Design a protein around this ligand. Structure first.
Ligand code: C8E
Ligand code: C8E
Ligand code: C8E
Lengths: 289, 289, 289
């Protein structure tokens, strides 16, 4: 069976003083198409493969291609995947929970470098033999994640730096906890990063959380992000503040809202301020198809 | 929801004395696939996005990719679109009504340069930040069209030439009228073009029309095209003659036929002569899927 | 109507002493998506077109695009195709019958150069104006095939070398016979190749066959391949031995097995040895969607 899913988003993206002779506000948009092929068996093993075609404003040649494949095999709550896989640090819960606005951006997200599902092709040739293996397992409210990524699998392994990651998250109805650790993140020798987060749903209406990170070799250093959101019917108000160890940095912060216009249609905006006093704002829509 | 539609066409394309060591007749064909994603809401606002994958014989690398996206939002007869939009001068009725043959070509089409929906990627990089906004509105038999296209939206607007177009067409059962005007057409300062056309269905079987254009800065100058067609059951006979102001040009003309073989399947041929006495002929099929 | 079909395959691919500083075993995988558009008519003529998007591990830019189109028209057992067609030597039965392993490889396949359906784009530009025409006709158990391929159809034909091929195969329930001949195979003046094969199903469980080839201008020279397979319930055991005329070559051979895990899911492995004593082995899965 083959199925297609995706989304489109378009809105205004404002960056204070982006550059000499550059408009500070443009229309930024993205079109995402996923192509999923799956084969189900009567033995309960589901085989799958996916491809992604993703277009973003400003993309080279004003064109769209697919990325590199991802294959998986699933059985009894376990999934093993190969090729362009989702990684542990990028898949755990809570780590992207302060993101806001129609581009789901946050300075309160982790300031480190690490591998992740590659949504598009890469013109530098750096991903040509990139190959990952990941394993996930969901023990009810408890998710476990494991990923190994070799940036160039054709070359003797002793000559390249492979990334190894693990994560686990857990949740009941009102508390969630999440943790992840990754060594040689992004193929960088000694770039070892970690994440621990916790969140509390202090209603059915509100949640507050805290994420801490060790950003490994990044200039940012350790980081803490405090975030919260509140739902008022169809609108959701979100806010966060984040600090890094880097000498002299400002405290990052942001405020935003999400309006659930209909199932599949969300209007979102945000005003944020970064660690180097960058001012960014957005307003747009996303629709899921 | 995601849907796919398209067509394929293949036939012979003959160009008199195309060039030294070049075959005058080749097999020219095109494969077009549209990918449409739409999200409907109970509030009557439909959100949509589309992508196109188009292959033509002779295409670089013998490959196919998608073009840049187009997004739209529709409500009560109004449609607002963003990104790679259809423009006013290219979308009005009647302006392509003399086209014929399986490649739907005509020297009697407007001889100017202007922006239009870009069916493919562009290897020069000229379209990378091309961004348009269009608005259409259909007041029963009366269509209205508006388009604004900024060729590079990242750069201060004062430094680039934006294209602005408007058009309207109207039709009852037997007369149609259409008009369009576009300033700085194709991003060219002072390339201001206009179109006025009219057509008369003098039966349920025949139509005759006239299109006049101001081709702006083009070498062609003003132009007039007279065309007509007649349906004989499943066959349609078409003809046109066109003149331009350019000193010394020949009167362009063509004669063709369309055979409706089945719903979705059309066999078409044509013999045409251009403004510089070029001789072109074609014969082929198009099938819609 | 538009339909999508394809498959995904992933496993281990081992090449003895592949190269200094190169891992002998990697994970090799392929994702194939076919896009088929067809238009049926009440007159019994079916029009079709297809496109292919194929990703293989190691592919340039870690991306995927479509290849060049293929169009066809079918009526009463006859199919005429244009553009990127299947050729006679590549489509006849039996010629790939000794292939084994999850990559369906065999040194016992023909050692010549010839044109074939191009599954992907080609970055050299060599396929840009490549255009073929093929005709197949199936007279019950008897298939006939014809293909003409012009590598650059825009240039006077006298200046290029066109490939012409024919083949026929025939089968009752227990014997199959197949033959093919192609002149100027692969666009190479005087590269004339031929194939004759025969196979005998000596049960409902076993088959043995022999293929002979004239590999035209190749260094290999004439070739003979002897192969056989036996089905044991859900497993199939295959073997082959092949010899070429090239002075000094080793006898090529291989042994493999296929496990039909479920409809659409096949686990396959193989150990093979080539003409220059290369050692290759594989083990993997293929799933059809
Ligand atoms: C990301 C979308 C895929 C489109 C990228 C193809 C990029 C092609 O160009 C790479 C640079 O070299 C220039 C190519 O020659 C011109 C190609 O297109 C022209 C005729 O169809
Ligand atoms: C228009 C279809 C998309 C295909 C265009 C990709 C063009 C790639 O080449 C651009 C020029 O540079 C050469 C690239 O290196 C070779 C690529 O493919 C070979 C292995 O899969
Ligand atoms: C085979 C898949 C299609 C992808 C191939 C596109 C190849 C593009 O590069 C060709 C070589 O020239 C370099 C291009 O400039 C960078 C492109 O992408 C970056 C921003 O989206």
């Amino acid at each position: 069976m083959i199925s297609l899913n995706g989304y489109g988003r378009f809105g205004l993206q404002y960056v204070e003083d982006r550059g000499v002779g550059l408009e500070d506000t443009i229309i930024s948009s993205r079109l995402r198409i996923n192509i999923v092929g799956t084969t189900e068996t009567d033995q309960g093993v589901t085989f799958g493969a996916k491809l992604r075609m993703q277009w973003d404003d400003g993309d080279a040649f004003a064109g769209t291609a697919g990325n590199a494949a991802q294959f998986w095999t699933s059985y009894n709550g376990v999934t093993v995947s190969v090729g362009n896989v989702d990684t542990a640090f990028d898949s755990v819960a809570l780590t992207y929970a302060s993101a806001m606005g129609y581009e789901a951006s946050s300075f309160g997200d982790a300031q480190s470098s690490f591998f992740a599902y590659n949504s598009k092709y890469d013109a530098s040739g750096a991903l040509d033999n990139y190959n990952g293996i990941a394993v996930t397992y969901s023990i009810s409210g408890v998710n476990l994640y494991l990923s190994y990524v070799d940036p160039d699998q054709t070359v003797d392994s002793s000559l390249v730096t492979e990334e190894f990651g693990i994560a686990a998250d857990w949740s009941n109805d009102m508390i969630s906890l999440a943790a992840a650790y990754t060594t040689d993140a992004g193929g960088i020798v000694d770039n070892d990063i970690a994440f621990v987060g916790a969140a509390y749903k202090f209603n059915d209406a509100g949640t507050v959380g805290l994420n801490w990170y060790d950003n490994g070799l990044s200039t940012a250093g350790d980081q803490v992000t405090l975030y919260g959101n509140y739902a008022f019917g169809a609108t959701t108000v979100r806010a966060y503040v984040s600090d890094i160890d880097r000498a002299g940095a400002d405290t990052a912060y942001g405020i935003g809202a999400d309006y659930q216009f209909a199932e599949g249609v969300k209007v979102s905006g945000s005003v944020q301020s970064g660690f180097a006093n960058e001012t960014v704002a957005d307003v747009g829509v996303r629709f899921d198809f």
